[PDB]
């Protein structure tokens, strides 16, 4: 994709495409900058995931407006509306599983077999357990299981490694912790599993924070206070 | 339950 | 377009796609619903409205980060950063000016011509001005006259049929004579044709809310706000 | 200077 535009230029547009709040703009830039075929920094890792996250987010968010209503109406004195909110939710449904099979197929095609360092694989395997977890939340059909178990899967390589390779406050390492908790909670109904990974997560950053700088400390209790409200709203 | 907002660079 | 959906799912789904606020896919429902060549209720003429309105919203406001960015980027002292910014702000600007096109496009093929109604051939003719006056924000060569008087027409035949046949606190009327005050504030160099406008247009609704029943009363105060919060700003 | 908002049916 953008084939005939500079990598330079498309990582330029995708910096002013956030600016102007044009995520779909964004990730299109990112994707053609994916698909140059070279590594990324982090920086560039961050646009990636920034833009995608807002685009799904934004279809998430429809997806879930549309299936309360279409719930609605599939309930008892409930007056037939004829298939409009059933076929419209299908297609919001349809727009996000794309969006989700096309950031899984960056990752797949090539990000994740040439990243090598603990901070980009880990950055790339949380991505497919996030974009995975989508998926589920969508799915009902044959496959939901074996959605669920490819976003368990993405999670927990990710957690391995960043458990062996970074700090207990590493940032990317306490937004997988959270990000994985909430998989447990919300998709794969184990509510005591994200609860006490969670409160480990918490605790054991917070034991690490002696180490860190003024700036890494912001960095680390911003997503720590994130694991704190979560614990809070499950216990 | 939230997760990483993630939305801002 | 749309042209195999019924135009009553079209406007089913438009009121569904504004509760998930998925503007663009309300738009493309009401212009297939606009394309099937029956005129509109005042319902029907509000979806539209209100689709394009936020897409169009959306479109200006990234153009206006995109041109600030740009100007900056020219001003004295300023590292030069290629042709970046000008390409995706004048990228933004074409996607932005088909918008206003394709509304233009519905209103001349046929909305207008076949509104025969004070209130519904002034509704339409006040759209015909707002994206003539989006337009305008953004042109800058030949035509920019001509873009301008465009918009400055369609207001000055929306404001003649009203005082003919509206009372002074109608919501369309207001909202009219507010629109076309920014017009001449903003885009017509006129700020005392401007205040002018929206002050008499203040008052003369000021003596006629006595006519009205509490919601009619707060329907047409809340636009008065706006003029005033427009006078407060202008003198 | 704003216009109607014009963005909520
Ligand atoms: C998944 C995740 C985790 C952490 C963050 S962040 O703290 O906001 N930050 C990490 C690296 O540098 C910029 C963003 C985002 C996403
Ligand atoms: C241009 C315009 C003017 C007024 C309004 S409104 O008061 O919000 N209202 C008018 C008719 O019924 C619903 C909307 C909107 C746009
Ligand atoms: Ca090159
Ligand atoms: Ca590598
Ligand atoms: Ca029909
Ligand atoms: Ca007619
Ligand atoms: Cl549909
Ligand atoms: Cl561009
Ligand atoms: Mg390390
Ligand atoms: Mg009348």
């Given at each position: 994709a953008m084939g005939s535009m500079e990598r330079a230029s498309l990582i330029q547009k995708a910096k002013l495409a956030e600016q102007a709040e044009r995520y779909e703009d964004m990730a299109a830039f990112m994707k053609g900058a994916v698909e140059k075929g070279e590594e990324l920094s982090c920086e560039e890792r961050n646009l990636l995931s920034v833009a995608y996250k807002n685009v799904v987010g934004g279809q998430r968010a429809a997806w879930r407006v549309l299936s309360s209503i279409e719930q609605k109406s599939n309930e008892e004195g409930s007056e037939e509306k004829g298939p409009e909110v059933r076929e419209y939710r299908e297609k919001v449904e349809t727009e996000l599983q794309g969006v989700c099979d096309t950031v899984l197929g960056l990752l797949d095609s090539h990000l994740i077999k040439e990243a090598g360092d603990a901070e980009s694989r880990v950055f790339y395997l949380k991505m497919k357990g996030d974009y995975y977890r989508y998926l589920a939340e969508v799915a009902t059909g044959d496959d939901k299981k074996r959605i669920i178990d490819s976003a368990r899967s993405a999670y927990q390589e990710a957690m391995d490694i960043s458990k062996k390779?970074?700090?207990?406050?590493n940032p990317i390492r306490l937004g997988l912790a959270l990000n994985f908790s909430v998989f447990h909670y919300?998709?794969?109904?184990s509510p005591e599993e994200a609860i006490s990974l969670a409160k480990t997560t918490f605790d054991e950053a917070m034991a690490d924070?002696?180490?860190?700088?003024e700036d890494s400390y912001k960095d680390s209790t911003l997503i720590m206070q994130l694991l704190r409200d979560n614990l809070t709203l499950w216990t | 339950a939230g997760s990483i907002p993630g939305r801002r660079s």
């Open positions: 390779e970074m700090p207990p406050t919300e998709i794969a109904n924070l002696h180490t860190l700088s | -």
